[PDB]
What does this fold into?
Amino acid sequence: KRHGSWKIQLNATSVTHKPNAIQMALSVCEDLISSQVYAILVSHPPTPNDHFTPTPVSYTAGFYRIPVLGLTTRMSIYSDKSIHLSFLRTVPPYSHQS
Amino acid sequence: EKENITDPPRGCVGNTNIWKTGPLFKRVLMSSKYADGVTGRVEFNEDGDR
Amino acid sequence: LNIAVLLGHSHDVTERELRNLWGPEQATGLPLDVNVVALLMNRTDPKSLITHVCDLMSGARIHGLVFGDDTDQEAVAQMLDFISSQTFIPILGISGGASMIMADKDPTSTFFQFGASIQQQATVMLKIMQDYDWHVFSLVTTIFPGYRDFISFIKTTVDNSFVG
Amino acid sequence: GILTTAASSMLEKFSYIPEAKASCYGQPLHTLHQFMVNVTWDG
Ligand SMILES: *[C@@H]1O[C@H](CO)[C@@H](O)[C@H](O)[C@H]1NC(C)=O
Ligand SMILES: *[C@@H]1O[C@H](CO)[C@@H](O)[C@H](O)[C@H]1NC(C)=O
Ligand SMILES: *[C@@H]1O[C@H](CO)[C@@H](O)[C@H](O)[C@H]1NC(C)=O
Ligand SMILES: *[C@@H]1O[C@H](CO)[C@@H](O)[C@H](O)[C@H]1NC(C)=O
Ligand SMILES: *[C@@H]1O[C@H](CO)[C@@H](O)[C@H](O)[C@H]1NC(C)=O
It folds into this structure.
C-alpha cells in the first residue's frame, strides 16, 4: 500500500499442520523450493508434538540460506546460529529471563 | 536499494550451490532498526532476538 | 546388518570395490543377514536427500546409514541429524560437510560424525603452544557464533594449566 | 566395523535390536544409542 509506485508485488503462501514431521518437511521443501519464497515464517505452537520443533523448516531454508522467523517458539537451542544457519526470532527465549 | 541481488532458484533441479547474498540479506535483517510495532518496538540484538 | 553407504561426492570412486570392501571381510559374523547398499549421489539438494532416505528405509528396512561428502555444506549432516531425529537409525558422517562439527546433539538423535570437536581441537592447539613454550598469547575472535564456548573453554583450560 | 561391532556386542545381549520404520508415509527401547559407548576394531 504505502511502499511506492515501484512494480514489486508480494504473493502469499501458507502450509498447515501435519502430524507427521517428515511429511511436514516434504510439504515445506517442495512447496517452498517450487515457489521461490524469499522469507519464511513459522507460527505453529499448538502441536501434539510438545517438543516444539520447527527444525525441518529451518534446516531446509538454511540449506540455501533463506531466513526463518520463529514467532512462538522460545527454546534457547535455536539461538545457536551455527546450527540454524538462517534462523531469527522476535520473541525472547527463557534464558534471557535470567 | 542495492545491486547484486540474485534469486534463490528452484533448487530441486540441479542446484546444490548456496544463495550468494544469504549472509548479506541476513545481516540486513540483523541491522534492521524499527520504531513502529503493535506489540512494541522491535530490534535485533547480538543473538538476533527481541 | 542392512547398511546403506551413500556417497554424495565429486571424487571419482566406483561402487563395486565398496562391495568388495565388505565381501571377504567380517571374519566373525555374528549377524546372519548383513547387506551393503553402495550408492553414489551427484546432487545433494534436500529433496533428493529425504527422497533417497525414504526410498532406502522402504528399501527392505535398512538399519544402518553411512554418508560421505567432499563439499563444504555442513547442514546436510544436520539434515541427517533431522533424519536421526525421526528414523531412529544410527547415522555416521565421514568427511566433507558430513562431519563438520555441530554444537549439541539430541537424545532424540543417534547421529555421529567422524571428526574432532572444537574443544578437542583447542586442546591440541594448546598442546602445540605448550610444546614450544610460547607462553604469551592473545585471543582474537569475530562475532561468528561458537565464540563464547571457545573463550570459556580456553579460560577453563588455562585455569587448569601448569604453565602459568 | 564399528557398526558390526556394536551389533555383534548387543546381539549377544538382546537379539531383536533391528527394529526399523516401514516408510515415511503414514505415521523400540533396546537401541544402540547408549550401548556403543566403547568400541574396538583391530585394536
Ligand atoms: C501466488 O501463490 C498462489 C499459491 O501458490 C498461486 O496459486 C498463484 O498462482 C500465485 N500467483 C502469482 C503471483 O504467481
Ligand atoms: C556488486 O558487486 C561488484 C563486484 O565487482 C562490485 O563491483 C559492485 O560495487 C557491487 N554493487 C554495488 C554495491 O554497487
Ligand atoms: C509497551 O507497551 C506500550 C503501550 O502500553 C507501548 O509504548 C509499547 O508497545 C511498549 N513500550 C515500552 C517498551 O514500554
Ligand atoms: C548422478 O546423479 C543423477 C541424479 O540422481 C543420477 O541419475 C545418476 O545415476 C548419477 N550417476 C551416478 C554415477 O551415480
Ligand atoms: C566395552 O564395554 C563392554 C560393556 O560394558 C564391556 O563388557 C567391555 O569389557 C568393554 N571393553 C573395553 C575394552 O572397554
Observations:
- The two ends of chain A are 41 Å apart (CA to CA).
- The pocket of 2-acetamido-2-deoxy-beta-D-glucopyranose (ligand 3) is lined by residues B 40 (CB under 6 Å).
